[PDB]
Structures are given as structure tokens and as C-alpha cells.
Amino acid sequence: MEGFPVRVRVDVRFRDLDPLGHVNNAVFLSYMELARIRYFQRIDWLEEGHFVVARMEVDYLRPILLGDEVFVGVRTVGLGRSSLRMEHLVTANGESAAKGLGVLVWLEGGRPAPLPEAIRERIRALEGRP
Amino acid sequence: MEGFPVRVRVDVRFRDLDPLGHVNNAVFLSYMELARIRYFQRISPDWLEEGHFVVARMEVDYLRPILLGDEVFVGVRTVGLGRSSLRMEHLVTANGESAAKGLGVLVWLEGGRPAPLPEAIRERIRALEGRPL
Ligand SMILES: CC(C)(COP(=O)(O)OP(=O)(O)OC[C@@H]1O[C@H](n2cnc3c(N)ncnc32)[C@@H](O)[C@@H]1OP(=O)(O)O)[C@@H](O)C(=O)NCCC(=O)NCCS
Ligand SMILES: CC(C)(COP(=O)(O)OP(=O)(O)OC[C@@H]1O[C@H](n2cnc3c(N)ncnc32)[C@@H](O)[C@@H]1OP(=O)(O)O)[C@@H](O)C(=O)NCCC(=O)NCCS
Ligand SMILES: [Zn+2]
Ligand SMILES: [Zn+2]
């Protein structure tokens, strides 16, 4: 997916659907998550890289139907002190279906702490940006 | 829940947890959704069709982690009415403390496309809220 360093495929499940036959709003975040976890695996993925989700902003652009070909890309768009801002793009049949902006927070001892330089450099390398 | 006309209780499932033992970010939206649906049930019979609304946007702030065993309540209320849209605030509490807040934009559909919220639905919302809206 152009503009995104990591992208994954997801198969729409019957279980993902609302009664009218389109993907449920919360399930979109699980699609976005698969991409983010794969991205974290590159920069303790079971511990979500020691990051916790502090905020998620999602715009649902087009409904996702059973059988749709779905891809999800993810990239870092901001690097803070203890936070990381990530953009996730879910497409259905080549069309943008949802955009999610998430704020991830690095924890140490269960409290926010400055992202380690080791993680910052791996992110800069992955994104190819300073 | 003070300030919310509709609230529901949620039981945290083992299935709801991330490996570290706290509730998954996406599951929080399903908690919020239960209250929203219960609310729509108060205004319309077509609740399976989600009151004919589709979620256009959700803004969720995760304030505190929710753990297995936590006593969870979810309150929901309409904070604004648009043309074909409406804004709803969802409050999830865990053991009496604010765990997450969600602001959602719901859009009313007719024939599969946005249409003005009917007066009948608006009147019921205003009645359920019992406050200027
Ligand atoms: C994430 C969490 C640790 C933040 O706690 P906090 O008291 O806000 O800590 P701070 O405000 O000092 O954290 C730093 C800030 O995080 C931010 N942040 C936290 N919540 C935010 C939000 N809702 N929106 C935007 N930014 C937020 C920052 O903007 C700032 O980042 P910075 O370090 O780059 O300056 C806490 O809210 C969390 O425990 N809530 C539950 C998270 C939930 O469990 N995630 C779902 C499971 S993964
Ligand atoms: C929601 C949806 C019907 C909107 O289609 P659209 O072409 O943008 O329709 P319009 O722009 O004419 O709708 C009117 C606008 O909706 C808004 N709206 C739509 N998307 C919005 C967003 N992402 N954020 C804020 N407002 C939004 C308005 O702000 C405005 O409302 P108004 O009637 O009060 O003026 C369409 O994007 C939807 O099919 N996306 C998929 C939704 C998804 O399936 N939900 C998950 C399952 S419930
Ligand atoms: Zn987690
Ligand atoms: Zn739906």
C-alpha cells in the first residue's frame, strides 16, 4: 500500500457483521490492530510492545461487506515524548473504507515513560523519515 | 449513572482481554455500543438495524484500563442533533471511575443514503433526554 510501510490482509468473517450485513464499527479497530501489531513486531509484541492505546479516532468512510478484499496499512505520523501517533488505513476492494488515528503510549512500571531511543530509531528507519 | 438517560452493566469476559490482562481497545466500543443500542430501543423498534443509523465516526479516549472482575457500567446520551447526523457521548466506568469516553457521530440512512433525522425520532430523543436539545 503506497505511503504505508506495513500492510496486512484481513478476511471478513460472518461474525464481524452487524445485522444489516456490513462490518461492525468495533471490528474495524481489530482490523487496524492486526496491522499495528505487525508494525510493532518490527520496532514483546504480545505485550503490544509495551504500548497501550490512549485514543483512537476512526472515520468510517464506506461499509465493508462479506467477501470484500480488505487490506490495512499503518504508519507513524507523529513521535512525542511517551506517545506515538499512528495512522491506519483500511481499504475494501481498493477503496478507502476507514481511517483511524491512534495515540499509543509507552509504559514502564505501568506509567507513561519516554519512548526508548532504540524504538525511535527503528521507527525512523521503517518510515524512512526523521 | 448521573447525567445519562440510559446505562447498562457489562461483565468483563476473559475473551475481552489483551495478553497483559486488560480489556482490548476495540472491545471498549462494543461496551459503548450496548448502551447505544439499548438507547435506540427506547426510540425505535428497528434496533437490529441499529435504529437505521450507521456509525460515521467514533472518538474514544481510553482513560483507565479495565480488568477482569471490574464492575463496569456504560452510560449514553445524545449531545447534539445535526441534519442527518447526531452526536452521542458514551461513558464507561470501571469500579466507579471513568475508564473511557467515546464521542460518536451517527448518521440516519434512508434507501442507503444520508437523510434528515425524522421529527418523530427527534421528539423521542428530546423526551428521553429531558433536557434542552
Ligand atoms: C494511556 C494512559 C497511560 C495515559 O495516562 P495519562 O495520565 O494521560 O498520562 P500522561 O498524560 O502523562 O501521558 C502523556 C500524554 O499521553 C497523551 N495522551 C494520553 N491520552 C491521550 C488522549 N486521550 N488523547 C491524546 N493524547 C493522549 C498525550 O497527549 C501525552 O503524550 P506525550 O508523552 O508525547 O506528551 C492512561 O490513560 C491509560 O491507562 N488509559 C487506559 C488505556 C487502555 O487500557 N488502552 C486499551 C488497552 S491497550
Ligand atoms: C456515514 C456515511 C453514510 C456518510 O456518507 P457521506 O457521503 O459522507 O454523506 P454526507 O457527507 O452527505 O452526510 C452528511 C454529513 O455526515 C457527516 N459525517 C459523515 N462522516 C463524518 C465523519 N467522519 N466525521 C464527522 N461527521 C461525518 C457530517 O458531519 C454531515 O452531517 P449533517 O447531516 O449533520 O450535515 C458513509 O460514510 C458510510 O457508509 N461510511 C461507512 C460507515 C460504517 O459502515 N459504519 C460502521 C458500521 S455501523
Ligand atoms: Zn492492550
Ligand atoms: Zn452497522
In 3D space, the residue among A108, A106, A53 whose CA is nearest the CA of residue B64 turns out to be A53
Phi and psi of A26, rounded to 5°?
-75, -35
The technique is: X-ray
Q: Resolution in A for the shown PDB structure?
A: 1.9
How many CB atoms sit inside 10 A of residue A94's CB?
9
Q: Which three cell numbers stand for residue A28?
A: 474495524
Distance CA A87, CA A4 (A): 9
The 3 state secondary structure assigned to chain B is: CCCCCEEEEEECCHHHECCCCEECHHHHHHHHHHHHHHHHHHHCCCCCCHHHEEEEEEEEEECCCCECCCEEEEEEEEEEECCCEEEEEEEEEECCEEEEEEEEEEEEEECCEECCCCHHHHHHHHHHHCCCC
The domain limits of chain B are 2-133
CATH of domain A2-130: 3.10.129.10
Taking CA atoms only, the protein residue closest to ligand 2 atom 20 is B56
Q: Is the CB of residue A52 less than 8 Å from the CB of residue B53? A: no
In 3D space, the residue among A69, A86, A85 whose CA is nearest the CA of residue A9 turns out to be A69
A60·B55 Cβ contact <8 A:
yes
Pocket test for ligand 1, best of A33, A52, A56, A105 (most atoms within 8 A of CB): A105
| CATH 3.10.129.10 given to domain B2-133 | yes
Taking CA atoms only, the protein residue closest to ligand 1 atom 27 is A54
